[PDB]
């Protein structure tokens, strides 16, 4: 009941939407995505560093808002939180961090992803963090198409979940997924 | 202030439980990479930018640790940035050597950062390679990476004095070439940056495919 | 696994703890820990895993084949002789193995009960009371032991002993198998400890 | 064996339209001191084989007894020994990976890299290597050590693939290993001027060319 | 000494003559048995006529050069143009009071119109000793007797550019870590002047 | 005499090691006598420290480490209608596809049963090797070998092998006129048990809720093994009489 | 004429050595609400497993500036020295800004860091004892 | 698999001939040969039911 | 101490079908970062419609090779030419692989053929000898991307019972290709063995050299 | 040419490696009683944790002899070492004194060791199985 | 190798000349700096002009260079005088046989009337080299170039012992592990000779 550390986190890009989805435990609250706005963050690994990166990321996009009068776009995020990593060198947090979300002006969807010192790695595709599974990266890959309906992504995206669950833990796995348009945000939860 | 040592012990607590060449030619310096970027055994990127700009004419390519590598040249341009505007002056590539070395220095090699540096300032053209702990050295032709000792190789065998911009450009071109296919961590494309006196650089994204 | 001996005025009483394995729940109801060396001659052990029942099925082997082609019984002090030197041959070209038995008998010769200790290094010593396995039932022996005491007066004793155990034991422990060498041969005592 | 105390460098070989070209260099050396010079590391076996050996000069002296000692052994009650029961490189690379993979199994393995090169009685080209831990493999190019990382990259842009033997001839195959010798030369500290390179041809027969030495070295830029 | 460390794997010879003194290295730097760099220049200048060479850890010298540099400078603008002795003196504090934490040995090769031509040798742990000549490097213990047979007082420069070119053939034939063209630079009251030799001419010898 | 002549007449089969039969034999150069041993050749590096090394070497990136038997729930018990033997049939999953039903019962022959535990490997292969060698016994003897002495055979081999590596759990059931019902439980160890009630693997404390009467009718003992499989959650059941095991699947 | 920091270890410890967290009951030993430490952290602790970088980096500019005026103790004299020190205590003595921590443009311009940036400057970084009377009582030594 | 008749009457045969050297060349075992003969009936799907 | 392992990291893949088998393997033989070769068979023909292939250390896979077919010589000649079957096969390599068990070969077996009935067969083997009938395997560095494309395509979606020889070629192809646009050993070639009742043919194709 | 003893290691193992006391009701397993040695000695015991000297003392002499036959083969041919084995195998095979365990007269002389003494003459050294019966079934091979 | 042994640092030349071979060598054992023989004799005969010098361990070539005096006298009980081929072929065998055991390295001169005079030289390992001269131990170190530098063929008697008094010189005066006088024999058609000379004469050269 209190080992949460782990989990997955998949992000994918269709055409003017994005997807993000994570894993969830059984029930009788620990949710891995935190959103500023309408910037998506997903971190993996130890439980006390997702919940002090959250903490830190909230802090510092308030303080963002109030100074600037905008809500903070997905490419600043990104920047703010590589180099937030990157202070830390040598006593690294235990994560993997995820970003997604939808540039405002352009309209151009955008995923990121970040190793435990801040590293980006910007993806056009998808991003897989975690270590739960070793095949959903692989299932990722062969489920994939570019330029993908807000539908057809959903379906992807809950496919390959399901697909790594089944052969991997069960009795009581979840997910939660968020599809991101320019305007529109839905949140999902499958018990599957 | 400054890199944070907060949860060493934590951390210690819980353990306890590419090609880049750079060929100098009769006008100007050239840098080039290939584009391919893994994590582990698995080709995480096909087109990746490894070239960085230090300054509009001043630019590096990297190996080691990439968060450092990327850090540390920021930083640089920064300062070099800060310098140039205080001096009202073009930045020179010796100033920039001399700021990666005594940072890299003062660090005692636990910033893994590993540099080519090409460079045009009005003294010249230049180029160096540059140490984690902090040595640098000077070369016409340099190279870096898992793939440097077939790079290395092909630039051993047609490097000449007397190179103009297209043969500096080909030679640099069949040097990340030669990583690229007997390499497993290149592979991808090539990019290229040429950097010739009197003129901007010239910045070409996938130079080959 | 834990042991304990008392040599009562007329007789030897012998308990061993039927434990069992760890990682494997059994359920079984015998005493795999002590094997009869003759009529008169008991051995219980305890120690690692099966090195010592492999040991104690060697000696028992032993003593039945002397037994047979002598038509005769050795006495107890000379079948604690002949563990002592086996034990000593066993481990003179391998890394020691964690051993210790008790041999009680009745000597009908001289007609009188005796018990002996042998220790994994091979250290054989004669003693009115003995234990191995326990962490203290010394000073509970040494307060209530008399040479002459009655076959009751040391079952008593070891009732006794057994409880000071339980005491500071778990309830993973399920009992303790007692039995008494004396002129008549071997017994158990199906009453309790 | 356990250790290496005197060592050779690298090997380097490739086939041609019409057979194989070998080559090494002939330095011995002691750690970092350059010990011994004139040390030959290529072995004629026959009229048609030709053995390079990098790493342990002792277990390289033992591999050159036992060839001499299976040349023997053929030519023992052999008439023919010379022209049709003749020994074959597949027969001495079969026998010497053999003996790697025995030796590797007794935990006291022969510190060598070994390359056989020649032409088979058909006229097919024969190029593989072993080394100490049995590992046997084969290409059109081959190399050991430095040359591994170095040599193989120049000499597989003449030859690319199997389609592209029948295109080269003795010349360009020749040049190319020339040009990979000066640049091992040039990037290796354990390397030595002075080489030793071998022709088998299913023509011409084996032409063994001793006392060779690196020649136009780019030693003029560094005035400035 | 610190791991993954670049080291100075060469051939140093420094020799004073009768004009003047003349410093000479290789132009070799590897790792492990790669080279790095063959066509690298060893011959450091601290002062217009005041040049060393470097052994051990290539950051450590190259940051203990630099600020005596720096340190020399800071003198010319006050008492004109420093001595050797001085020179081999901010070295020598350098490298001793930072001997626990960096590895460095300097040669130290110098002229001026009191002296007359100096060298100074200062190895590993900081100690200074002034010679009539030195050698340092990997390859300097090949020709320790070589030159113990072939060293003059009062050598002309001719002489001395043979002794120097003969001893360095010899050290970079016999050592792996040293190779490439040989350094010269000659400094007497005429000036600077720099020299280069290279394989085909020096292996002939 | 001119047998020692050859001996000291003469190289290169001392360098193939060929001079010994046992390295002849291993690469089937004479024939195939390696493959006719009742008792099995293991090879050993000719080392100091053989252990030491097999230890370093086994505990360490590719799908080429030694697979290990299942750690699930196993059941075995006995009653007047003989033996009733319960293993949780959940099947993990890989890079790979199965044909049919993964037994994770090993058939010694038609009237002995073992469970693997511990090394796949090395409890398929001792457990048919012991198959091997009670058939043997069998038709030496002219009659079917009891349980006991199976399982002392099984415990005396891996007792001889004890410390080189090896690791394997069973329980040997059977029914014999003679005995009864039985069940043994050996490992590599060397301990040999004999018991009325075993529970081997991960929740072995909740199935071990055994209930339990020498009374209990077939079904009965089917339906209380199905049931405490369950608690200590499909299940797999046998049910081994004097007449030999019968498989049921559930 | 140090490059590297040394002398970094300390020799002595003493329960009252950090005089401005001291208890007020018991003024031989510290006080552990107003350290707002966590409240579990001895200072042995501190002594022990620290990473080997940590004080060369916490004391590298100190070390160089050191250098830089021995330097020009020996080359110009003890004057030159005296008036950097002077002009830098007096820059340092007379800022007092509770509600900030950067520094000063002067100090800058003193050190010869106009137009420099370092990780100090990118990163310059309770329920007790964290307010302007705290920094006051610590200038003002009362 | 089971093996075929004619292979086990092969092995019968191979023992028979210790007295003198072996089939795969083994040193003498016997002091005489066998006094015994065999009759060996047998069935396989190779070859069906044989009598040797 | 010397170390006698070593990694020729490749990747093998083994199908059976209704009445074939195919064994296929990247022909890619490398050491660490290098490439010791571009064209190295991992995947023999031993005879008697058995196909085999060991992946891992290169030395020890061929070691284990060699001695499978000279013991199936010697089986022909002791049994009057009888024909080995793939069960028996499985027996033998299991029986080599024990026979090395406190000294054990770095590989991983796969082994294809025919079964009595004609249907196709695959097993796969541990180490140290424990193995397994299957009807998909994949093995070696790339083995968890070539699975999940194989569970996509076919379900075991037309039925794999129902495929044909050059369906499963073409899914073979497909998976190895992108395998090799994913994963840095993954490359250069790939040839595929399939078993009939009318014997053994071999299929060679290209995959991309980078 | 070896003067230090060479290949000691044993390359396989098997549980019947021991002809002479394999058991009779389990032929593929040893008889641990008639084996006295003390009924607690696994085999797997033997291969590790040996005094690394007791190998090179054990072969020590018969190293040295094959050395000497090595030489006379190069120098002399091989009829010389043919015969110096043949008459060492004639005398040892016709010795059959189960009471006693010392070396006869003509196998020292032989091995020119009539005045040489080591500590092998001065140190030359059950329930089941030590009788005369048992020495002749192993010299007999029956 | 072994802990506790003793270890032979010396310093060894042989020398072909055009009568034939010079063996010479100093006289210095220590025992880490404690010198525990200053006179003793490092020039070893294994047949009557064949003679060896060794380094490595003491005992272990002192054992193989008894078993190949032995073999030598087994040798020339059939054959007449071995060459010295032949001596350094068996050196060769013992040393590479026994590699993993023993620490062996020996150089090995002689004389015949079919080769006139040849040295061999087998570092550790066991490999065998025929050269022209060869010199080995802890202070050949310092001689490498000094000898390259002044080796001619056909030299004469006097001018050989020159040469090896001035090397052995040289690597004495360098070398902490070399001392005492220095011993050689002179191997040729005439016979044997045995020379020694004094500090007194050698360190004024």
């Known amino acids: 009941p209190s080992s949460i550390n782990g989990g997955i986190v998949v992000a994918m890009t269709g055409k003017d939407c994005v997807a993000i989805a994570c894993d969830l435990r059984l029930g009788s609250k620990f949710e891995k995505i935190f959103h500023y706005g309408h910037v998506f963050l997903g971190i993996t690994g130890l439980a006390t560093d997702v919940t002090t990166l959250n903490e830190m990321f909230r802090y510092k996009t308030n303080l963002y808002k109030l100074k600037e009068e905008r809500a903070i776009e997905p490419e600043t995020f990104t920047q703010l939180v590589s180099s937030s990593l990157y202070e830390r060198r040598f006593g690294p947090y235990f994560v993997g961090p995820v970003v997604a979300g939808i540039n405002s002006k352009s309209g151009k969807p955008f995923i990121a992803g970040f190793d435990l010192i801040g590293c980006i790695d910007e993806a056009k595709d998808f991003i897989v963090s975690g270590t739960a599974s070793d095949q959903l990266f692989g299932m990722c890959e062969s489920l994939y198409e570019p330029n993908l309906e807000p539908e057809d992504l959903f379906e992807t995206i809950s496919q390959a979940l399901l697909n790594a669950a089944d052969r991997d833990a069960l009795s009581g796995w979840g997910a939660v997924v968020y599809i991101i348009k320019k305007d529109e945000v839905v949140k999902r939860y499958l018990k599957m | 202030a400054g890199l944070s040592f907060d949860n060493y012990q934590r951390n210690n607590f819980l353990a306890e439980n590419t090609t880049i060449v750079g060929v100098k030619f009769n006008n100007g310096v050239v840098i080039a990479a290939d584009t391919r970027s893994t994590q582990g055994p698995i080709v995480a990127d096909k087109n990746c930018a490894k070239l960085h700009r230090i300054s509009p004419k001043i630019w590096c390519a990297g190996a080691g640790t990439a968060a450092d590598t990327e850090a540390v040249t920021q930083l640089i341009g920064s300062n070099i940035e800060l310098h140039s505007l205080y001096t009202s002056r073009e930045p020179r590539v010796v100033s920039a050597l001399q700021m990666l070395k005594q940072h890299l220095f003062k660090y005692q090699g636990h910033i893994g950062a590993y540099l080519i540096v090409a460079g045009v300032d009005p003294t010249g053209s230049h180029l160096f390679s540059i140490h984690a702990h902090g040595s640098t050295d000077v070369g016409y032709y340099l190279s870096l990476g898992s793939g440097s000792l077939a790079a290395m190789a092909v630039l051993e065998s047609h490097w000449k004095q007397d190179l103009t911009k297209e043969e500096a450009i080909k030679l640099a071109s069949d040097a990340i070439q030669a990583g690229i296919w007997n390499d497993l961590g290149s592979g991808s494309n090539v990019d290229v940056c040429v950097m010739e006196i009197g003129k901007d650089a010239e910045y070409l994204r996938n130079y080959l495919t | 696994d834990i042991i304990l001996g008392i040599r009562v005025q007329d007789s030897v009483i012998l308990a061993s703890s039927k434990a069992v394995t760890r990682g494997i729940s059994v359920l079984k109801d015998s005493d795999d820990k002590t094997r009869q060396l003759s009529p008169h001659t008991l051995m219980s052990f305890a120690g690692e895993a099966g090195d010592t029942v492999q040991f104690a099925e060697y000696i028992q082997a032993n003593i039945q084949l002397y037994s047979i082609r002598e038509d005769y019984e050795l006495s107890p002090q000379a079948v604690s002789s002949f563990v002592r030197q086996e034990l000593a041959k066993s481990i003179r070209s391998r890394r020691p193995y964690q051993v210790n038995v008790l041999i009680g008998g009745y000597d009908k010769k001289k007609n009188k009960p005796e018990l002996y200790q042998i220790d994994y290094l091979g250290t054989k010593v004669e003693l009115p009371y003995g234990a191995h396995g326990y962490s203290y039932t010394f000073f509970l022996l040494d307060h209530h032991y008399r040479p002459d005491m009655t076959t009751e007066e040391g079952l008593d004793l070891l009732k006794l002993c057994v409880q000071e155990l339980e005491k500071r034991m778990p309830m993973d422990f399920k009992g303790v198998i007692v039995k008494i060498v004396d002129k008549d041969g071997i017994r158990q005592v199906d009453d309790f400890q | ?67 001499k000692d299976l040349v023997t052994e053929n030519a023992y009650d052999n008439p023919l020994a010379d022209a049709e029961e003749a020994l074959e490189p597949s027969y001495i690379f079969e026998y010497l990976a053999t003996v790697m993979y025995q030796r590797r199994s007794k935990m006291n393995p022969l510190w060598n890299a070994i390359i056989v090169a020649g032409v088979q009685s058909n006229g097919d080209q024969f190029l593989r290597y072993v080394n100490l831990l049995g590992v046997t493999y084969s290409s059109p190019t081959l190399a050991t050590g430095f040359g591994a990382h170095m040599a193989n990259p120049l000499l597989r842009k003449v030859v690319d693939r199997e389609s592209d033997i029948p295109k080269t001839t003795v010349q360009v195959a020749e040049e190319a290993i020339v040009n990979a010798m000066r640049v091992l030369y040039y990037r290796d500290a354990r390397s030595s001027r002075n080489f030793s390179l071998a022709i088998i041809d299913k023509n011409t027969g084996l032409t063994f060319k001793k006392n060779l030495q690196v020649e136009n070295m780019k030693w003029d830029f560094a005035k400035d | 000494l610190k791991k993954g460390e670049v080291s100075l794997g060469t051939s140093i010879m420094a020799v004073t003559f009768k004009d003047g003194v003349i410093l000479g290295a290789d132009s070799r730097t590897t790792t492990g048995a790669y080279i790095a760099n063959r066509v690298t220049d060893k011959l450091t200048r601290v002062h217009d006529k005041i040049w060393c060479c470097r052994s051990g850890s290539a950051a450590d010298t190259q940051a203990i050069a630099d600020i005596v540099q720096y340190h020399l400078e800071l003198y010319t603008s006050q008492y004109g143009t420093p001595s050797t002795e001085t020179a081999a003196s901010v070295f020598k504090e350098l490298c001793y009071e930072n001997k626990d934490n960096l590895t460095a040995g300097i040669i130290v090769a110098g002229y001026d119109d009191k002296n007359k031509g100096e060298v100074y040798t200062i190895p590993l742990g900081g100690s200074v000793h002034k010679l009539p000549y030195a050698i340092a490097g990997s390859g300097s213990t090949f020709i320790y007797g070589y030159c113990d047979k072939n060293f003059r007082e009062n050598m002309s420069k001719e002489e001395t550019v043979d002794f120097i070119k003969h001893s360095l053939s010899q050290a970079i034939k016999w050592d792996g870590s040293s190779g490439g063209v040989i350094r010269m630079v000659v400094l007497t009251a005429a000036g600077v002047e720099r020299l280069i030799f290279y394989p085909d001419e020096y292996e002939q010898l | 005499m001119q047998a020692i002549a050859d001996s000291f007449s003469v190289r290169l089969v001392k360098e193939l090691q060929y001079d010994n039969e046992q390295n002849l034999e291993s690469d089937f150069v004479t024939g195939a006598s390696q493959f006719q041993r009742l008792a099995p050749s293991l090879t050993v590096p000719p080392i100091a420290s053989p252990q030491q090394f097999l230890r370093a070497h086994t505990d360490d990136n590719p799908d080429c480490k030694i697979k290990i038997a299942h750690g699930t729930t196993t059941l075995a018990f006995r009653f007047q209608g003989g033996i009733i033997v319960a293993v949780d049939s959940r099947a993990t999953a890989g890079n790979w596809v199965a044909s049919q039903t993964v037994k994770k019962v090993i058939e010694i022959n038609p009237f002995l049963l073992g469970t693997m535990a511990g090394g796949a490997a090395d409890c398929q292969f001792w457990e048919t090797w012991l198959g091997s060698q009670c058939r043997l016994h069998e038709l ?17 081999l891996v007792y001889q092998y004890k410390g080189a590596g090896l690791s394997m759990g069973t329980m040997i059931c059977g029914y014999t006129r003679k005995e009864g019902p039985t069940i043994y439980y050996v490992d590599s160890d060397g301990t040999r048990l004999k018991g009325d009630i075993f529970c081997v693997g991960s929740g072995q404390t909740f199935a071990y809720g055994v209930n339990y009467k020498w009374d209990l009718s077939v079904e009965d003992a089917l339906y209380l093994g199905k049931r405490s499989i369950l608690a200590a959650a499909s299940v797999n059941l046998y049910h081994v009489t004097e007449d030999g095991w019968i498989y049921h699947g559930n | 004429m140090n490059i590297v920091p040394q002398d970094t270890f300390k020799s002595q410890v003493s329960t009252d050595q950090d005089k401005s967290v001291l208890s007020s009951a018991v003024p031989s030993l510290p006080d552990t609400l107003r350290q707002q430490e966590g409240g579990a952290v001895p200072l042995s602790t501190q002594l022990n497993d620290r990473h080997p970088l940590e004080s060369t980096l916490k004391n590298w500019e100190t070390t160089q500036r050191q250098r830089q005026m021995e330097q020009y103790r020996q080359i110009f004299g003890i004057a030159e020295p005296m008036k950097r020190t002077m002009e830098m205590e007096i820059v340092n003595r007379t800022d007092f800004n509770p509600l900030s921590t950067n520094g000063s443009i002067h100090r800058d311009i003193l050190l010869n860091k106009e137009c420099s940036i370092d990780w100090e400057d990118v990163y310059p970084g309770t329920m007790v004892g964290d307010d302007v009377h705290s920094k006051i009582e610590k200038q003002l030594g009362i | 698999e089971d093996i075929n008749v004619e292979s086990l009457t092969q092995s019968v045969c191979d023992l028979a001939l210790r007295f003198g050297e072996g089939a795969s060349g083994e040193e003498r075992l016997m002091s005489r040969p066998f006094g015994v003969a065999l009759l060996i009936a047998g069935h396989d799907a190779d070859d069906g039911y044989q009598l040797f | 101490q010397f170390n006698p392992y070593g990694d020729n990291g490749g990747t093998i893949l083994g199908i059976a079908g209704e009445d074939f088998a195919v064994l296929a393997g990247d022909t890619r033989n490398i050491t660490d970062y290098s490439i010791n070769s571009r064209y190295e068979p991992k995947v023999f023909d031993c005879g008697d419609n058995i196909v085999m292939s060991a992946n891992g250390f290169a030395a020890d896979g061929d070691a284990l090779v060699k001695r499978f077919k000279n013991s199936v010589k010697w089986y022909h000649f002791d049994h009057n030419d009888k024909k080995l079957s793939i069960n028996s096969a499985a027996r033998n390599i299991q029986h080599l692989l024990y026979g090395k068990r406190f000294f054990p070969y770095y590989v991983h077996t796969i082994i294809a053929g025919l079964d009595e009935d004609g249907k196709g067969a695959v097993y796969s083997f541990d180490p140290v000898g424990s193995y397994e009938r299957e009807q998909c395997r994949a093995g070696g560095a790339a083995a968890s991307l070539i699975m999940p494309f194989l569970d996509n395509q076919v379900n075991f979606k037309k039925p794999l019972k129902y495929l044909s020889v050059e369906e499963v070629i073409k899914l073979v192809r497909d998976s190895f290709t992108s395998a090799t646009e994913r994963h840095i050993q993954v490359g250069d070639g790939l040839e595929i063995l399939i078993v009939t009742k009318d014997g053994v043919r071999k299929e060679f194709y290209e995959l991309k050299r980078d």
């Not at chain 6, 030496?140 to 005396?156: D, G």
């Open chain 4, 1 to 67: 064996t356990q250790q290496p105390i005197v060592t050779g460098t690298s090997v380097i070989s490739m086939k041609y339209d019409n057979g194989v070209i070998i080559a090494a260099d002939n330095l011995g050396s002691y750690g970092s001191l350059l010990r011994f010079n004139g040390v030959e590391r290529l072995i004629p076996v026959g009229d048609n084989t030709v053995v390079g050996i990098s790493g342990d000069i002792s277990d390289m002296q033992h591999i050159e007894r036992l060839l």
């Open chain 6, 140 to 156: 030496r003897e002219k009659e079917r070998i009891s349980v006991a002495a199976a399982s002392k055979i099984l415990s005396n």
